[PDB]
Design a protein around this nucleic acid. Structure first.
Ligand SMILES: [Cl-]
Ligand SMILES: [Cl-]
Ligand SMILES: [Mg+2]
Ligand SMILES: [Mg+2]
Ligand SMILES: [Mg+2]
Ligand SMILES: [Mg+2]
Ligand SMILES: [Mg+2]
Ligand SMILES: [Mg+2]
Ligand SMILES: [Mg+2]
Ligand code: NA
Ligand code: NA
Ligand code: NA
Ligand code: NA
Ligand SMILES: [Sr+2]
Ligand SMILES: [Sr+2]
Ligand SMILES: [Sr+2]
Ligand SMILES: [Sr+2]
Ligand SMILES: [Sr+2]
Ligand SMILES: [Sr+2]
Ligand SMILES: [Sr+2]
Lengths: 186, 154, 160, 140, 95
RNA sequence: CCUGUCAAACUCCAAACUUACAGACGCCGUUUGACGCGGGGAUUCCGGUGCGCGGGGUA
RNA sequence: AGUGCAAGAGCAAAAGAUAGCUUGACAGUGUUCUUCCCAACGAGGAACGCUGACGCGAAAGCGUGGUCUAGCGAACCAAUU
RNA sequence: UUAGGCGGCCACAGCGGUGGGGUUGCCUCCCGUACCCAUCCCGAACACGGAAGAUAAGCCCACCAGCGUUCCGGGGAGUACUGGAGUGCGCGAGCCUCUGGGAAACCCGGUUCGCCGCCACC
């Protein structure tokens, strides 16, 4: 911008959306990337592969299409993230994808976080992904227990649109139950 | 189709320039060859530009030179209409001359040596130290200029 | 030392001060003469001294010619005459001299010169239609102190 | 339009630039939360050749902690127009700096797709003196 | 030359054009080539490792295999056949 | 702002040209066997001149 | 800017800074280039592998010393494992 | 792509500026700290939980050329420089002719306020 000699960062760098150094180390595996992302309200998991004119998403799942299988709960929590990973994972298996490397983009590797939940979900779907068990939240938290107890400290329902009062991780179970099943229209 | 006549000897000429002439089948002073006007050949003549005289000859001129200096790929069999007719895809020299000028064939294709070994220019040439535009004999010529030279060397 | 020793451009450009030390100071006292508070546009006449050959002019020569030129313009128009003259070239080329046979010959630094391509303006004056003949005479004296032949070219001045 | 434009306090940073500390204790009481050590850079003739080593302390307050502090702190100063930043900030004094900004300032503080705040959304000295003065005190 | 190290006289060829300065895009550092493919050799100033001898810059060789992630490229230095170990970052497909 | 100048160890630019690989044409090779490979025998390792480009030096 | 030291070159969510942890400045054996353009020549050097054992990291991955090009030494003999 | 994710090329994409856009949709800002996790001090950030409010930031859509950049026309310029040739010129440094190539600065007028790929989505 200042002159002929000025160096402008690559576009995805200005936009502060792509860590190119991590990207490179990621691509060095030769495997597909399980692109785990999250929004204030949603969570998205994509299986991306390298292409001539750009990346190629072979399969993917969004927390939105989770309802499509019987989900009346919010979509920005742990149970949401895990199930979304599993959904994307299952679809990945469908398209012939068998292994991946977790790409958490610009999110932090916080133990028990959602990007890791997406990963645990994707792994259960039968996908082979290099991981570390002691960095994944404990089963119960994945189910959504942590939020149930929070609702126990009631006085005012945690959720506005009455999905339920004391909330239900058992719903998480019903949905995972529905996904791990064969039938399911992926 | 341009006619190429070497007018300057090999002593002291760049080797890559001398090899170019040889690739164009000329190995002696006063030897002439006919070259198609292709981009590849164009570069070649442009490279030998200072040691040769070239240009497009007239149908008649070509015919005179062929009758007088054309030779078989091998042997001393004189080349005349009968030779041409009994040995080529043409009826006489004119047919050959025309096909050559129109780049439809080559001397080799018709069993003739690629080279026309001309005679020294009767009455001498315009000198080999200057190009045509400066009164010399080197470089590209008019169809008339080339005809004058080729005929004096018939 | 004869200018025959340095007048030609037969050596690489040698001007890098960061790699050369002991460079003698220039003898050129001023590059802008006359009334330098005024613009050259304010004059009807503009005459330049043009060098006819490419050469190198040692600073000692620029000073002598420039001096014998401006000196005349001062004696003829006054220490404040309404005119202005410029020496547009600066001696950037450092010169040497090998002053022990041809062994370790790289010379020591002895001076500076300005490279002037043929056809260039070495000097340029701006005067009024009156003092036009005085500047032409100042240049006649100047080109007598530099190597090449010169042309005294008159630019804006159709008062012939 | 005005709701997501009306100023607020991002942080109140109390700090004592000493030069060699034992002063942390008072800040810990006048503010309410733990202070932090301050290291220096570059060697200094004034017997300050040690690069990394305690020289000061500061406390950054946000939300209530910040307000509850200013309530009893602001009355201790005589604010002036000069004492204001070109960004809409002011510091008085033991130093007391007040960082003011508009709602979504996070856009420039987050890790993902962060972005610099447009000059239009940047607070102004004028818009700053107002908000503040418009709450328990006077200007110039 | 005054010295004979590997980077002797390589000021130009190993310097980046100002605007190409900075970490290079990962795509060409992960590119895959097949045996027999023609590849132009050119060191990328921004990439430290996987380089070949600067003297070879400008060669167009033939991939004949791999050694780890690096490629073994066949070239002819003058009249001498040589094998060069080089990473994709410093290679480009011909045509 | 305007106005006067530069760079062998400066470069926002930038040739001619040199150069890797390939295709085409040319030339050449498959009884004159090219290209390549193995082996025998050397001589040679004071060079010079013109032209082009130089670096040193008043030359 | 910094990055130990010449010069030229490389580097910005880093190759720089701070903090923490750690000993890959590891063992075995190669490929290739360099040394020595072309074109044979040793020591030395570098890039890139396989095997073993490890460090850190969620993991991809990084680590065969210091971002790159200087910091080096035959046979005989001695000491050492 | 009525606002999304991962990218390729890496300023034609930068700098600056104007206008337009969102009731259970999207992205955000935004609300809030029991948990996982977090600040050498701060739920600021990171992380988690969430919808009262908002389109003012961001973002997306439409657009402006003043600066920077890309390409194009016309002029500079077939100039500067240059591969091949010469019993052409010059005391000489050097120049010229023929043949084959051929800039840069700068001015004027246009272009450029990204293009493209995969996935998802009233
Ligand atoms: Cl994200
Ligand atoms: Cl190599
Ligand atoms: Mg015969
Ligand atoms: Mg004559
Ligand atoms: Mg150079
Ligand atoms: Mg001994
Ligand atoms: Mg010992
Ligand atoms: Mg608006
Ligand atoms: Mg003469
Ligand atoms: Na401290
Ligand atoms: Na780069
Ligand atoms: Na060796
Ligand atoms: Na907005
Ligand atoms: Sr000389
Ligand atoms: Sr004279
Ligand atoms: Sr050369
Ligand atoms: Sr290294
Ligand atoms: Sr907050
Ligand atoms: Sr003389
Ligand atoms: Sr042309």
């Amino acid at each position: 911008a200042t002159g002929p000699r000025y160096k402008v960062p690559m576009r995805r760098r200005r936009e502060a959306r792509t860590d190119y150094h991590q990207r490179l180390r990621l691509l060095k595996s030769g495997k597909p990337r399980l692109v785990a992302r999250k929004s204030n309200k949603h969570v998205r998991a994509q299986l991306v592969t390298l292409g001539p004119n750009g990346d190629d998403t072979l399969a993917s799942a969004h927390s939105s299409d989770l309802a499509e299988y019987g989900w009346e709960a919010p979509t920005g929590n742990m149970p949401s993230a895990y199930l979304t990973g599993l959904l994307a994972g299952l679809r990945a298996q469908e398209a012939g994808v068998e292994e991946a490397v977790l790409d958490i983009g610009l999110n932090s590797p916080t133990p028990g976080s959602k990007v890791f939940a997406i990963q645990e979900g994707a792994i259960d779907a039968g996908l082979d992904i290099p991981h570390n068990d002691d960095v994944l939240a404990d089963w119960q938290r994945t189910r959504g227990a942590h939020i149930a107890e929070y609702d126990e400290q009631l006085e005012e329902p945690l959720y506005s649109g009455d999905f339920d009062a004391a909330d239900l991780p058992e719903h998480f179970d019903e949905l995972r139950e529905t996904l791990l099943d064969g039938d399911i229209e992926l | 189709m341009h006619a190429l006549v070497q007018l300057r000897g090999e002593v002291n000429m760049h080797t890559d320039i001398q090899d170019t002439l040889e690739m164009l089948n000329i190995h002696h002073v006063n030897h002439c060859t006919l070259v198609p006007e292709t981009d590849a050949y164009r570069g070649m003549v442009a490279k030998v530009n200072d040691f040769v005289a070239f240009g497009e000859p007239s149908q008649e001129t070509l015919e005179t030179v062929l009758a007088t200096r054309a030779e078989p790929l091998e042997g001393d069999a004189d080349v005349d209409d009968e030779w041409v007719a009994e040995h080529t895809d043409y009826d006489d020299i004119s047919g050959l001359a025309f096909a050559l000028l129109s780049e439809e064939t080559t001397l080799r294709e018709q069993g003739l040596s690629p080279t026309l070994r001309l005679h020294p220019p009767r009455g001498g040439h315009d000198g080999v130290k200057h190009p045509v535009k400066e009164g010399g004999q080197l470089g590209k010529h008019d169809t008339e200029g080339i005809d004058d030279l080729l005929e004096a060397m018939r | 030392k004869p200018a025959s020793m340095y007048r030609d451009i037969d050596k690489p450009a040698y001007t890098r001060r960061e790699y050369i030390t002991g460079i003698p100071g220039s003898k050129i006292a001023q590059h802008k003469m006359g009334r330098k508070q005024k613009d050259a546009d304010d004059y009807p006449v503009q005459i330049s001294l043009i060098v006819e050959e490419t050469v190198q002019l040692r600073h000692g020569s620029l000073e002598a010619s420039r001096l014998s030129a401006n000196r005349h313009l001062i004696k003829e128009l006054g220490e404040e005459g309404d005119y202005k003259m410029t020496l547009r070239k600066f001696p950037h080329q450092v010169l040497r001299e090998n002053k022990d046979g041809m062994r370790a010959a790289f010379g020591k630094i002895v001076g500076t010169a300005a490279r002037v391509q043929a056809g260039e303006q070495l000097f340029t004056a701006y005067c009024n239609v009156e003092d036009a003949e005085h500047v032409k005479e100042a240049f006649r004296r100047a080109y007598n102190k530099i190597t090449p032949s010169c042309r005294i070219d008159s630019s804006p001045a159709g008062n012939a | 339009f005005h709701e997501m434009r009306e100023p607020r306090i991002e942080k109140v940073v109390v700090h004592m630039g000493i030069g060699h500390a034992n002063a942390e204790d008072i800040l810990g009481e006048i503010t309410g939360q733990m202070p932090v050590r301050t290291k220096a850079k570059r060697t200094v003739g004034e017997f300050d050749i040690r690069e990394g080593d305690p020289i000061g302390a500061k406390v950054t307050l946000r939300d209530e902690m910040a307000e509850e502090f200013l309530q009893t702190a602001l009355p201790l100063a005589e604010l002036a127009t000069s004492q204001f930043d070109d960004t809409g900030n002011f510091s008085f004094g033991l130093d007391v700096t007040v960082n003011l900004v508009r709602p979504g300032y996070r856009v420039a503080k987050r890790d993902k797709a962060s972005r610099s705040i447009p000059t239009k959304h940047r607070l102004n000295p004028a818009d700053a003196v107002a908000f503040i003065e418009s709450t328990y005190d006077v200007e110039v | 030359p005054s010295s004979n190290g590997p980077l002797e006289g390589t000021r130009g060829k190993l310097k980046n054009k100002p605007r190409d300065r900075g970490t290079s895009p990962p795509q060409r550092a992960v590119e895959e080539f097949d045996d027999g493919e023609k590849v132009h050799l050119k060191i990328d100033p921004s990439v430290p490792n996987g380089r070949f001898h600067p003297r070879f810059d400008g060669q167009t060789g033939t991939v004949e295999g791999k050694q780890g992630d690096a490629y073994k490229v066949d070239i002819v230095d003058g009249g001498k056949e040589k094998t060069i170990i080089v990473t994709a970052a410093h290679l480009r497909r011909q045509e």
